[PDB]
Amino acid sequence: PREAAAHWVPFEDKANMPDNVPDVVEVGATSAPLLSASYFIGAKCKPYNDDFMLCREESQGSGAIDCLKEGRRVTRCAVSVIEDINKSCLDEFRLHWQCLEQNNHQLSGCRKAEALLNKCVFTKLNLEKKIPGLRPDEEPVFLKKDPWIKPAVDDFKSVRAYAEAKKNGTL
Amino acid sequence: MLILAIISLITFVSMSKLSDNRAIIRLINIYLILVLVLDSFLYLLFLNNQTYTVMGELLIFNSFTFYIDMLIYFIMIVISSLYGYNLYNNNLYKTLFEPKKELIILFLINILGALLIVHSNDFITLFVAIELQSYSIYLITAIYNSSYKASKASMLYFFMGGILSILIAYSINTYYSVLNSYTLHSLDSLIINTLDLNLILIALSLGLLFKIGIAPLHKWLISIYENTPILITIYISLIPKISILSYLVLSNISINSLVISILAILTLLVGSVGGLLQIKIKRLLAFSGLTNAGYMMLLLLLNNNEFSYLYYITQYSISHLAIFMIIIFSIYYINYINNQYNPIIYVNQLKGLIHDNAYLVLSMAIVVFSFIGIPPLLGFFGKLNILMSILNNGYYFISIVLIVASLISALYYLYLLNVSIQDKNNILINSNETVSSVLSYILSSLIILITFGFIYNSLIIDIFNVYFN
Amino acid sequence: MIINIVEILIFLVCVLFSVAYLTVAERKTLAYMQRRLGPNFVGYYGLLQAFADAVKLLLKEIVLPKESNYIILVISPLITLITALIGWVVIPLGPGITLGELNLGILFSLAIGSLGVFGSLLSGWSSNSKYSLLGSIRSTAQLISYELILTSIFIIIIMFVSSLNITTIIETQRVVWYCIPLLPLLLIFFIASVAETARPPFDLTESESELVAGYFTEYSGSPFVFFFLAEYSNIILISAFNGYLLLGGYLSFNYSYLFNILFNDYSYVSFLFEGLINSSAYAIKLVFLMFSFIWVRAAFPRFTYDNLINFCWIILLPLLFGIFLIIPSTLYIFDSFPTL
Amino acid sequence: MFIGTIILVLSFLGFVFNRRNIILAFICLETMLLGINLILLRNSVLFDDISGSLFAIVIIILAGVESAIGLSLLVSYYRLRGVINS
Amino acid sequence: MNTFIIFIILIPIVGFALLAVNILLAVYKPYNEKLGAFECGLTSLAFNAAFILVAILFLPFDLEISTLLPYVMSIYLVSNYGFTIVLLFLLILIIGFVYEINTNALKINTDSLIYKL
Amino acid sequence: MMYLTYYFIEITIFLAILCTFIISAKNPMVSILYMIALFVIAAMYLYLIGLGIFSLLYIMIYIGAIAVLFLFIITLLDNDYNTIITQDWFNIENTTLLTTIGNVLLTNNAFILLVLAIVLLLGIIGPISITMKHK
Amino acid sequence: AIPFEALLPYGIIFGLLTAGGGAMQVLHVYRNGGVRDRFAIDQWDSQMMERDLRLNGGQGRKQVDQATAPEAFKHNHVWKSERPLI
Amino acid sequence: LWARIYLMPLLQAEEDRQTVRRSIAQLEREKEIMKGTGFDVDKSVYNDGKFHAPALMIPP
Ligand SMILES: CCCCC/C=C/C/C=C\CCCCCCCC(=O)O[C@H](COC(=O)CCCCCCCCCCCCCCC)COP(=O)([O-])OCC[N+](C)(C)C
């Protein structure tokens, strides 16, 4: 779909869902927290996302109205994993997504906070971040040490926390 | 081969001196001959009327386009021979017929444009090929810039071709706006029934047809043909006609069109009637070309027009080349050269040619009676096939008009022979000079084809039945 | 709205005053290369010289010759000045720090540049002084010919980035400045930026010795101010193009360690300090380029028309097509086609 | 569809009823191509289809080469006569 | 109303303001001798082909250069395929450039003295 | 303020009618300057419909080269409903109009590109052939 | 020696550009609300930012990381009503 | 790219929910306006049975 052109007004619809449709909770995180949590959401909810997309394909055009149920499933899985992060690893999650807010949302600028967040989530939620499609020879960039590309300013709080973790031995 | 020739030729003509023009042109003449003979066997691909879409559905290859392609190569070979070889070795003819430095590259590029028009499967390819041919043909018109008439001609041609190209682009874009497509292959019987595309498709056909000069927009082209150098006119009057007509025949977008019917009628009448009062040779020949373009336009109103159109276009190409070559040869016996671009201009300048060269007039008679359609020359069978097609499809009034137009045009066809078999007081006594062997052999080959082609008619139809069915 | 206004006034004032002081800097630098002093009397240390010339020219009568199209003669300098200044809207002094953050920033730069030959093309027709006509035709020829070289170097650089956002092109250069792998391309951009700006040695367009004055022979008062201002603003702007295409724009060095020492959290102090560092890097690059324009003016004699046309179309353009062939070939060999 | 159509038709009428100059003729050609292209591009946008824009790019390039060749023809025409009296 | 459009609007206003200041403040005393065109102090057209030719050949070469914009914006997506296509395109154009060079398109008494003894 | 952006399309249309001053110009120059004005109006309209990159390409080519040539030469010679704009998330790449044009032109239509190369080759050879007198 | 009077205008230009850029950094940060700017943003980013506006109450680029969305998020959805491109 | 892929299903799902709501809502609105008239509001303009979100609103 194309973006809007010369003159447009945004308009809001005040109707409710039809009551036959089961209600569902909506994901409340914004762009930076969502981008921070994306890899864990994928790792956990991959089967449900795949099922949702397969339903949308097989519906062959009526996807919006035939694929509501596993859409509810997808949103519920996403909300569950975000809640788990909010319960178990909140401080590192905030480090990561505030760092992203500062660095134009480039994951390359938040490797230090991302290491802490990844360790916390692996230990307390058993989710691993992994980049699909790479051969064993190719190395995931977020695991690479001494990258060519570095942020302008290493985030202050993230640097302090990373050095602290290096002392504690958690990282 | 054609692209490779163009590239190499650009390199050489850059690095060669002005005296090497004719040797270069002989080189390309032989190269085209070699391609025609060595690569001819690719016909075998088209057995059972097998069609191939190529280049991501931009180009279409079938027996029809293969034949048009071979015909265009044959025409290019003949036309390049006229530049690559001197009729006579005297000073006068060095002045009369010298090839420009870039002329051969322009010829090859215009040929490429014509071949891409023929093969075009998509409208973008059609438009790019049309513009390629149009630009190259503008430049060919203009390359002899010492002529006032040639420059005036090139400018008028630029403007008329530009307007017709804009009409064509508009038609293409309206077709896009209605169907969100650039291919005619998307069209079907259901779609034609469902939607009224008649206006768009007829605008596209008219934009293409006014570029070869059908009435009522003829006169600008006849003026251009009159005002160009004679060896340029032999080319620019033929190749665009072939390419555009072949594309339209292959596309079949004006079947039973009432507007095309009326315009074909008008073209026949204007080509036949308007050529009667002519006194200049090339204007006479241009009105001939207009009438014959009318005969071919009739074939755009019906399906299964492949045989009649191919036969007609081939025999017309041969007759047209031959009549221009005869006019060229008859230059050696005129007593007044009008100028260096058009040595002979008035029909009456041939008066008494039979006393100077009897067999030149024999060849002239043969080609003229082919144009009139006297059996068993090729022209008769061309007209016979056309009449067969249009009567099979119920174009009765158009058939009557075609009869009448052939009758009328016979008058200014026979005008040439009439003045040619009259008597001149000063009759050649002797000469040491020999006409060039090569061009005389080529002219003779064309004459013998026109005379004795009919013996192969049944063999041709047998071949046709297996490659186009 | 208020913030937008303040940003525009700050940027506009900085650009206009930088152009004004570039003229003084030129006179002073040439002066010291010629063992003399240059303006040191109008204002302390000659710092008000440019405003003195300005005020004088704004008080000067406008002369409209008899055979002239007065509308065209007055509007041609105006349009060339407008385009020369409009070109500044996309120049960043830091990541995203610009008046116009366009995803088509490069295309905007090239287009507004291509709108730069119209002053030369129109003034000769407007003046009707014959010297102006000769200058105008020769200039139009030279400028378009060298615009080709500039556009070709633009394309070669985008081969490495695959983006028309200027900030992105600058950001990709943290790894290395593009003037390191493409040093010969940097030399050609200077030689061509000199020519495209119509500066010596390539000042054939308005050379006093071949043609008195130049296309401006007839321009007095504010129209002369406009041609003058447009010329120096274009000098700075094309130095800016050079800066962000090849010299890494506002990138100087990795100051992450230093900031982590100085500060412990984000603050307006630290944002301001970062802004000053980026802007200082970009402005020092601009200063070296402007100094180089003045240096080359001091060192070399002029070309002739035939000479510069021969240069551009027989020595430079073949090399640039050769580079067109050799840059994607090297990308292909090492499997480094840049992503979007 | 509106701006392009009107540019096309007004440029066409300027071309036909030109009895002032040949430069007007060149300009009407160029502006006709402009109007064709504007109609094309609006249709491209409405369909969210790339074929329209591809053909628009090709028209741009061909109009460039057509302008080059046409001006060269005009210059060659001028070389013989010294003056264009239209 | 972002900074872009406001700046774009603002620049011509500044130009017009400087022009109006000049018109308002400067004297204006035209007379015939002042209105004469300046040619070194006293009152008082064939050209070469290369003048025409630089301008005319600018347009094809400009189009060639600007035809590579789609390529450089899609280099990765077209991979080693588009790569080869754009090489062929470039070489075809280079041929025309060679023609231009070899024809010397843009470029603008040695007899002995013999006595009949 | 809102009626401005609403009628912006209709204003470009009106200015285009008015500028097509090209036909009635006393001076052909002046006619060429008005042609440039028409081209700027075209660039304005193109941005409005969502094709700004085309606005910039038009400025680059038709004004930067074609209008420059025009001037060079002549100095030398003597539907009331509103559309619903909806979002979806299936596009993860940063693919714009220029990238898609490059993609299709260099892969699906490489043939059109090479034929355009031949057309530009013509645009070089022709002018040399007719404006230059060899030897 | 190094001629400082020749360097004074260069110093003026350098300070002018440096101060102008620093002031522009501070104004951009202040407009953004304490974070740096977003550059080179595609369609995806624009849509994400619109969704952010729906989530955080229209407070610009403010971010919320609560798992569950407020009630008003379900009703403040916006489609755009775009005028006919004539 | 992989991050965006992992986010796409949930964002889409939300958008499909909004689409169904606003399409249905407009259907009931138009039906209510058309009560008392011999017109069927539920009949699609399309011949396939597939769901078709409205385009082309009435100007507001
Ligand atoms: C050693 C290789 C030399 C071959 C070079 C061919 C050059 C073509 C140049 C000019 C065209 C000139 C005449 C073309 C003949 C049609 C062939 C054919 O039969 O037409 C059919 C299709 O019938 C048609 O639609 C009607 C054709 C209309 C012909 C009108 C003239 C009739 C009289 C000509 C008599 C022939 C002279 C023989 C004298 C002994 C295509 O046949 P095809 O596609 O299967 O290819 C043939 C196999 N080939 C490639 C190896 C040669």
Determine contact: E10 vs chain B, CB below 8 A: no
Counting every residue, how long is chain E?
Answer: 117
- Domain boundaries defined on chain G: 1-86
Using CA atoms, how far apart are residues B227 and B339, in angstroms rounded to an integer?
Answer: 12
**Given CB atoms, is H55 within the 8 Å cutoff of chain G?**
no
- The tokens for H25 are 């809502």
> B238 CA distance to ligand 1 centroid (A)?
19
C-alpha to C-alpha distance for A102 and C266, rounded to whole angstroms: 10
> How many interface pairs between F and H have CB atoms less than 8 angstroms apart?
35
CA-closest candidate to residue E84, choices E93, E75, E94: E75
How many CA atoms are closer than 13 Å to the CA of B202, on its beta-carbon side? 14
Query: Of all atoms in ligand 1, which is nearest to the CA of residue B466?
Result: 45
First-last CA distance in chain F: 66
Does the beta carbon of A132 lie under 8 angstroms from any beta carbon of chain F? Answer: no
Indicate contact of A with G: 3+ CB pairs under 8 A. yes
Ligand 1 centroid from CA B305, angstroms? 18
Helices (H), B120-184: 123-142, 148-179
- Any idea of the CA torsion for D35, D37, D40, D46, to the nearest 10 degrees? -90
Residue B44 Cα: closest atom of ligand 1: 45
Cβ-based neighbour number of residue B108 at 10 Å: 22
C-beta B52 within 6 A of ligand 1:
no
Find the distance separating the first CA and the last CA of chain A, reported in whole Å: 45
Instruction: Round to whole Å and give the CA distance between C77 and C226.
Output: 6
Identity at E105, one-letter amino acid code: A
Taking CA–CA distances from C160, the nearest residue in chain E reads E72
CB B88 within 8 A of CB B436: yes
Please, is C16 exposed, middle or buried when counting C-beta atoms within 10 Å of its C-beta (0-12, 13-18, 19+)?
middle
The answer to whether residues F14 and D2 touch, using CB atoms and an 8 Å cutoff, is: no
Distance to chain F for B98, nearest Cα, Å: 14
How far does the centroid of ligand 1 lie from the alpha carbon of residue B239, in Å? 19
Domain ranges across chain B = 1-469
Cα–ligand 1 centroid distance for B248 (angstroms): 22
Counting one residue from C and one from E, how many pairs have CB atoms under 8 Å apart?
170
Which chain G residue has the Cα nearest residue C14? G16
Residues belonging to chain D:
86
Q: Is C46 left (phi over 0), alpha (psi -120 to 50) or beta?
A: left
Q: How many CB atoms within 10 Å of residue H36?
A: 6
Q: Which of H8, H10, H16, H18 to mutate to test the interface with F (most CBs of F within 10 A)?
A: H8
Q: Strands, DSSP E only, in B74-143?
A: none
Determine the structural domain holding residue C313 and report its residue range.
1-340
- Structure tokens belonging to residue B409: 């045009």
Distance (Å) from CA B122 to ligand 1 centroid? 28
**Which residues make Cβ contacts (< 8 Å) with residue C57, sequence separation at least 6?**
C221, C222, C224, C225
Chosen for mutation from G38, G48, G52, G80 (greatest number of chain F CBs closer than 10 Å) is G80
Q: Containing H/E element for B208?
A: helix B198-209
**B18 CB burial (10 A radius; 0-12, 13-18, 19+):** exposed
Alpha helices in C34-130 (DSSP H): 49-58, 70-86, 105-114, 118-127
How far, in Å, CA of C22 to CA of C291, rounded?
A: 9
User: H-helix or E-strand containing B53?
Assistant: strand B52-54
Domains of chain E: 3-28+32-103 (1.20.58.1610)
Quick one: three-class SS letters along chain E? CCHHHHHHHHHHHHHHHHHHHHHHHCCCCCCHHHHCCCCCCCCCCCCCHHHHHHHHHHHHHHHHHHCCHHHHCCHHHHHHHHHHHHHHHHHHHHHHHHHHHHCCCCCCCCCCCCCCC
* Closest alpha carbon to G16 in C20, C15, C93, C43: C15
Selection from B128, B134, B112 nearest residue B58 by Cα = B128
Residues of C in contact with E106 (CB under 8 A): 309-310, 313-314
A134: burial class by Cβ within 10 Å (0-12, 13-18, 19+)?
A: exposed
Q: Radius of gyration of chain D from Cα atoms?
A: 16
How far is ligand 1, taken at its centre, from the CA of residue A123, in Å?
A: 82
* Rounded-to-integer distance, Cα A5 and Cα G26, Å: 32
Please name the amino acid found at residue B44: L
Q: What is the distance between the alpha carbons of residues D25 and D14, in angstroms, rounded to a whole number?
A: 8
| d(C-alpha B176, C-alpha B170), whole Å | 10
**Breaks after residues in chain B, judged by C–N over 2.5 Å:** none
Interface check for C335 against chain A (CB to CB < 8 A): the answer is no
Helix, strand, or coil (residue B256): coil
| Number of domains comprising chain C | 1
Distance B460 CA to ligand 1 centre (A): 8
CB-count exposure of residue B431 (10 Å: 0-12, 13-18, 19+) = exposed
Q: Do H6 and A52 touch (CB under 8 A)?
A: no
Are C3 and G31 contacting, i.e. CB atoms less than 8 angstroms apart?
Answer: yes
Q: Is B380 in the pocket of ligand 1 (CB under 6 A)?
A: no
- Tell me if F57 and C107 make a contact (CB, 8 A cut-off): yes
CA-wise closest residue to B138 among B110, B115, B166: B110
Ligand 1 pocket test, candidate residues B49, B64, B67, B442, most atoms within 8 A of CB: B67
The Cβ-side half-sphere exposure at C268, using a 13 Å CA radius, reads: 9
Strand order in the sheet with A8-12: A8-12, G78-82, F83-85
By CB atoms closer than 10 A (0-12, 13-18, 19+), residue H4 is: middle
Q: Which two tokens stand for residue D41?
A: 């591009």
Interface test with E, best of D55, D72, D83 (most E CBs within 10 A): D72
Residue linked to tokens 């390629």: B132
Tell me, using a 6 A CB cutoff, whether residue B65 lines ligand 1.
no
Span from the CA of B235 to the centroid of ligand 1 (angstroms) = 22
B42, B314, B320, B465: residue to mutate for ligand 1 pocket, most atoms within 8 A of CB: B314
**G: neighbours with 3+ CB pairs under 8 Å?**
A, C, D, F, H
**Cβ-contact B203, B178 below 8 angstroms:** no
Look at chain B and count its residues.
469
A127: phi > 0 → left, psi -120 to 50 → alpha, else beta; which?
A: beta
State yes or no: chains H and E have 3 or more CB pairs below 8 A: no
Resolution in A: 3.4
User: Which token pair is B292?
Assistant: 């014959």
Task: Give the position of tokens 């927290």.
Answer: A33
d(CA C110, CA A8): 31
Question: Any idea where the domains of chain A sit in the sequence?
Answer: 1-171
Q: d(Cα F96, Cα C165) in Å, to the nearest integer? A: 13
Ligand 1 close to Cβ of residue B179 (< 6 A):
no
8 Å CB contact of A6 and F85: no
Task: Mark which residues 26-85 of G lie under 8 Å from H by CB.
Answer: 44, 51, 77, 79, 81, 83
- Beta-ladder partners of B54: B59
Q: Is B12 close to ligand 1, i.e. is its CB under 6 Å away?
A: no
- Rounded to the nearest 5 percent, the helix, strand and coil shares of chain A are 60, 5, 40
Within 8 A by CB and 6+ apart from E47, the residues are F76
F84 and H53 in contact by Cβ < 8 A?
Answer: yes
Q: Contact at 8 Å (CB) between B26 and B85?
A: yes
What number of other Cβ atoms are within 10 A of residue C287's Cβ?
A: 21
Q: Which residues of D touch G (CB under 8 A)?
A: 1-2, 42, 45-46
The whole-angstrom separation of Cα F101 and Cα D53 is 8
Cα–Cα distance, D82 to E96 (Å, whole number): 30
DSSP state of B62: -
- Note whether G5 contacts C: Cβ–Cβ < 8 A: yes
* Separation between Cα atoms, residue B16 and residue C92, nearest integer Å: 53
Minimum-distance CB partner of F92 among G44, G84, G85: G44
**C106 part of contact set with chain G, CB < 8 Å:** no
CA E55 / ligand 1 centre spacing (Å): 48
Residue H58 contacts G, CB cutoff 8 Å: no
Closest residue by Cα to atom 17, ligand 1, is B460
Give the whole-angstrom CA distance, residue B329 versus residue C334.
Answer: 64
Judge contact between A92 and A139, C-beta under 8 A: no
Residue B186 contacts residue D24 (beta carbons within 8 Å): no
DSSP secondary structure code for residue G70 in this structure: -
